[PDB]
From a paper:
Serine hydroxymethyltransferase (SHMT or GlyA; EC 2.1.2.1) is a ubiquitous pyridoxal 5’-phosphate (PLP)-dependent enzyme. Its physiologically relevant reaction is the reversible interconversion of serine and tetrahydrofolate (THF) to glycine and 5,10-methylene tetrahydrofolate (MTHF). As MTHF is a major source of cellular one-carbon units, SHMT is a pivotal metabolic enzyme for the biosynthesis of purines and thymidylate. Serine hydroxymethyltransferases, encoded by the glyA genes, are structurally highly conserved, with the active site located at the interface between two monomers.
Numbering used by the authors:
A (entry chain A): 4 to 52, 67 to 123, 131 to 411
B (entry chain B): 3 to 53, 68 to 119, 135 to 416
Amino acid sequence: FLEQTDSEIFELIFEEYKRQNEHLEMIASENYTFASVMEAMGSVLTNKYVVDKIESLAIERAKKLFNCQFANVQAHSGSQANNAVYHALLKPYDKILGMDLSCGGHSLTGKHYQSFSYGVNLDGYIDYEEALKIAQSVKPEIIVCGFSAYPREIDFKKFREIADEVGALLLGDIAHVAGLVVTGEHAHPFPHCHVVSSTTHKTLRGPRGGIILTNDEEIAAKIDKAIFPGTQGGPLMHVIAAKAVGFKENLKPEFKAYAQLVKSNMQVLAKALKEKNHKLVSGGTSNHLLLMDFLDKPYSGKDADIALGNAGITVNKNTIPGETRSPFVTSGIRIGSAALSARGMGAKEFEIIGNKISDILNDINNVSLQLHVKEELKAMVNQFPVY
Amino acid sequence: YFLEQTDSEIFELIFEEYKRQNEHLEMIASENYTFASVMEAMGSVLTNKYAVDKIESLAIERAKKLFNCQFANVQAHSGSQANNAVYHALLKPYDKILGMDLSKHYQSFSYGVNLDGYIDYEEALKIAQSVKPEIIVCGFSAYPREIDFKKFREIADEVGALLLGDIAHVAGLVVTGEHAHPFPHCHVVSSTTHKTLRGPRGGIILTNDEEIAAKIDKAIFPGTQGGPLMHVIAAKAVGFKENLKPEFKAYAQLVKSNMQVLAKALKEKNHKLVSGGTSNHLLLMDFLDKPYSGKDADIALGNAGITVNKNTIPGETRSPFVTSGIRIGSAALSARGMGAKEFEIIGNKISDILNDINNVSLQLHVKEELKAMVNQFPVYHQPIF
């Protein structure tokens, strides 16, 4: 009935749905939401405004899915989740240790905290020994593990060893691998982490929001008061019901297959890139993503992002360890598997995808090549429709 | 519907809420039934779109034509976050705010209500001369009459304050011409997109000053909160376009039309209303000199199908969690199409239960009679879109 009342909005929705169908989304953060989730998102629950039956069911499935004791499913974003943990567990000017991708470069500012950083190996792996050294120097009130551009598994255990020695808290931000964590395709953060924050979209393919989890009753109580309003007299029930719908789909064993599909596709893509002698940070991936490395190549990370978009492949420029160039051109790119794997695309496609990528960056200024593969890939993605 | 197959527990709760919206009479002033098309955009593939946009631009333009202003910001997630975004864009810390009550670093002061139940503009002037606020705020959740923006500008312009009209509770009436218009008297206007507007839940900030409009955009830049939610902004544009139709002006007259019928009916059964009536979508009963409480009245009719809330009234005797008044709104039942015939019946059923407030048998009896009335006024035909 949008086709009858609002023509202009309807053309914009169809424009978008055709736009999602006719390109390869390989940005690591992007995915296609469960159809069932959009259904709840567009229900009469937007009308309704002391526990509600629906946030219970969301918290119930949240606890079962993430294997924990308490859950706050009211965070509006992955950033609020992290920020809400900070207000609940810290005091002003408390120190915060977190990850970046520098190598050895490590008092910096926060919203009203002090941020310190630990980095990675010369092998692109997290340097845990260096982290304990920094943790012993800084003596931080909290440590954050988790990172958007990290191509490998995080060792939540070794981090709790560093936090126990230093007398710190351990926040697990699994917002980028929650799909892999939830299905056993990634080290679980519990019981090593005092708190876990995460986004409910991305790899979990739920609605857009945050979630907070913990096994400690006192932390759960403070998280409830820190989230406090959402600044609204109404808890948005349709979004919460959408959250519970997304959690039940994540518990299905079909989702566990999706998760290993996401990782094996990444394995195919990474293998296909190296066989043509491209360089990946840490030499590969154990993740939903890889990071190409262009430090010793004529073109930039900016250059490859633009070129590959011209071919209809949406990727992500990203700085890498040992960054030579400016932060707004960078020396790498960050490619994701989770979007195509939700389409049902398997190993055969991601290998063709892998060489079509290799062909374009081995010839970064061949505009006609980029255009040939764009049409060649639009016909593939047309064979694997979303919805 | 996938949800019936894939998740019957959630669908059970969705169909339960939809069945309930047609099982009781909804009379909370702030509650209403969003347009069926708005919910259709809420569940679009626009969720997957992580990112100004053609859709954001179309929402802003419809906002300017619906609210008759030169600028609009659609990125607020609630009427409250829209107010706070205005304060944080225009006020340094320790600045002063003067807003209405029912008798960050910012300091709040209040104006109030005279004995008649109307805003007292003479006192509101005297408090603004003394406090010297940097912003005066109109708009109030439980006021039964029209806000005189033109006079609030005179108070603001006399003391050099900004005027913020908060038309969130009266927005459907303003953009229809059934309420005084906040422009161009108010320097800046805030509102919700639900309640009387019948759109999705969220906020809107309006202004005819460009340098104010630029500060707001930067205050929404930090409070963006990981968006923008393209399905929600697309929903807001859908509601604005239904609000421009002449069907909406017909509706907003019904909301006042029905509220006059009900207010008239309560008075001829010798019930006291705050300010003696309404110019509005809403009405407040006065139980000051009465043996029962606003909580007692709420619980009473709640168990009779009529969903109202308890409310403070000027010169309150009882606690805050017990009150001396109830607030009765008219918009949600008007969206169902109920008219003067139904709203007349409502008033007398309210008296019968208000004058025998502890007859639980009368309450369950009244609930069965008016649920057959509500059976003949469906709100939607579908639970999901």
